[PDB]
Amino acid sequence: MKIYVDGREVIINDNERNLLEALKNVGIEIPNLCYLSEASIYGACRMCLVEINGQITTSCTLKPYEGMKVKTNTPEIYEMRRNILELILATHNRDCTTCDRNGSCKLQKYAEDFGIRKIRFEALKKEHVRDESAPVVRDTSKCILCGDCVRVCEEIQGVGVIEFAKRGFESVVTTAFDTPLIETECVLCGQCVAYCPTGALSIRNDIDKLIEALESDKIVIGMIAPAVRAAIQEEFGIDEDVAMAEKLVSFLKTIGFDKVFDVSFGADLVAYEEAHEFYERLKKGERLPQFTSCCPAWVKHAEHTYPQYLQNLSSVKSPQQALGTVIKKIYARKLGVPEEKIFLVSFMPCTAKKFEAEREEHEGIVDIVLTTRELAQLIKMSRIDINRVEPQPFDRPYGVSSQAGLGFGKAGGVFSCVLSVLNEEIGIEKVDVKSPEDGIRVAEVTLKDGTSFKGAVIYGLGKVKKFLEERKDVEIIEVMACNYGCVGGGGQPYPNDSRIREHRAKVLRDTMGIKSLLTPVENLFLMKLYEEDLKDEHTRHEILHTTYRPRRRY
Template sequence: CGRCVQACQMQNVNAIDFAYRSYHTKVTPAYENKLDDSVCVNCGQCLLACPVDAIYEKDNIKDVLKVLKTKKHVIVQTAPAVRASLGEEFNINAGTLVTGKMVASLRKIGFKKIFDTQFGVDLTITEEAAELIERLKENKNLPMITSCCPAWIKYIEHFYPELLKHVSTCKSPHDMFGAIAKSYYKEKYKINNKELVVVSIMPCTAKKFEIQRREMKKEVDYVLTTREIARLIKIKKIKFNNLTDEDFDAALGLSSGAGTIFGASGGVMEAALRTAYETATGKKLEMLEFNQIRGMSDFKEGSIIINERKVNFAVVNGLHNAKEILEQIKNKKCKYDFIEVMACPGGCIAGGGQPIPTNKEIVQKRMNALYINDKNKAIRRSHENPVIIQLYKEFLGRPLSKKAHKLLHTSYIKRGT
């Protein structure tokens, strides 16, 4: 029907198109290459558009079930967006947070510990805010662009590799979590490295590609999408709707409200600005909500004064809006200091691994759930998470330290088109 082709065109990637004619017509990358050998960024928007499951993500359920049958220490982390969408797979209204039932189902499946990727978000924000402050002081490699979306990273590696110096070196939250799990957590709880397995539950198909990058050093072993974990719950015959709510495990399970909103377009920027402003100035932000960068608009912008400097920021919602601002940077006509780019329109909440259908109305409901959760959190700033504070005190030293750079930061490569 061509919906996948149209979705790819709308993302401004154009990795797939029609080939041949009449009865022989098919959808394929150029020259019938594999998707892995194309400019596909793995965003999965084609999956959401397909009405018959003709294109789908690589399924890792069997891999996870196999490792769960061993005596290995298998831990799992769940992304912010998953708790706001998983319920849809069990006929629960869109925008309903099912955090407690999700945690309970994961325990029944057999994971040793259930942790929150929002802990990794708080760590990412702490590092990213420090990196932004450093770049602003040195007036170097500005604007700084966010790095948490692996589809966006692959896009810029393919189409604008000359601008990679502008991208933050921070790993994405679930990879930071993996790095801490296989160092700090492993050492603290005396777990053999070969026995520790990290599984991520993500709203994103591109995360499956991300963990295979050489730069990530296998810090996360498997990624399951929201749809996959729903299938696994059903395979295990767990009655999701009847489960009693349970809490994440301690140690790597505590998070802030800033960690929650990471799943929505504009949320990364908002979370980072909360921390960047307060750590740079030593003052509290009077208003934590940055309403001008919330919502589903293609492009959002604003400014904030940090230590008498006006910092201009922008949020790019969906890859189809990235080209214009990248051309501005390329031609040295960009007025912004800090830019967030999310590949999927709406952010992670509308990722390629989310329940189908995913339309604007449903995405908005999921997004609203995250913002309400943020507002109700006791801690709303990433740098105030006591577990993050303890982690730096006991293990990392400070943001951007030598150890932090080794474990929490990465590099990128130039890819062909």
């Protein structure tokens, strides 16, 4: 398949959907604003204009053919491309300094490259929507109406709370009747933010509160999620490492953190309690199938969609809330300090954890939740070369975890850790792992004393509806709202695509491989905590368990 591009021979692949993709594969780039994420579609920007047979048409919607002659850069195409970019920029809210995409915005880069230095059109007034009621922040004045967020929220997440509304110049992506996002069925997964190519969808920034807390005379305690340490290196343009968590601990100590703990300890704690709860349920055959509750986005989705299953949800709170409650109700007592003098910071890869920390059932435990991007911003603001910081371990007694507990950061980690706990408590004869579809895995598990069961690992909200409709034999279901689990969380470094998430999972697996402890019971600090401050089911329920209530609009 030979084609003449600007009058020179170019060989493209035989089977090609459109000319633009073929040219892209053979290394020829055509300026466009349609290919913006993995959830992108062609047809909207109209900037991919090419001239074939004396006529100008989009290359993204053009089937190539043998001997075809295409001109990619002509005075007419230059004029029209510049006109289209000027049209976009005329009504765009151009405040890059305070924008979250500043530095990684295709629109900003094109403005720089095309040499747009004055707005030849007029910034006609629009009825822009600005929403800040949720950890996911909306600003439609920066929106380019690419529609990626709509497709993500509907097809990938299966919620569909944001849609195109109105038409023409007043077209806008928004909730129904411009409802605040916190009052809708949004699960605050942040996938729309992970896919948005502009600052239209962003994450609530809470660095000011952290700085104010570190300035005051209270004890600031921090805790880092498993998946933060596997992705934070992306902002610094460096290779992965397994010492990232300890370098983060050293940096946090430098900027004035009294203690830094590992949320993997909370993951081990949660897996222990979850495994015991699930075993008791299997013994009595009550409230099955059991649903994991460590994903706050899935918990909110269940409260919105499956009010009948809220009893099937595990009563154990997520690792963040469990560890924070232990720190506030046991460690603070141990440290000889009032509970109100501790400022507990949580470093998470997730936007839904920000919502969880504010739930009326968890009010006050976690003071602020900062995402991987907010931690990377802190490091970059300090200008400290993180590639040269000497690593130091986490503070005692919540600075170590089993490899399974650290595995919570990728899909299937919590079910794996639960299986490890059960194997060390009873023993697993065999496990038969299947892959019914892309993001679903079902395991058939046999214990030593009979009583086999089936567990399922579902990552990617929206795969849940069909799975729960079409199956009734699983006993425990593990739901993670984000694809690949928490390594692809909404608060993770941008861009957040499938190959990035696979690499993050590989980095997390490498970091797991170097951990000496194998199972939560081998964690001597966890067992000490149990034997000392979590003896009876009363304190265990008060510290490690939460309740769920339905959500509906009226």
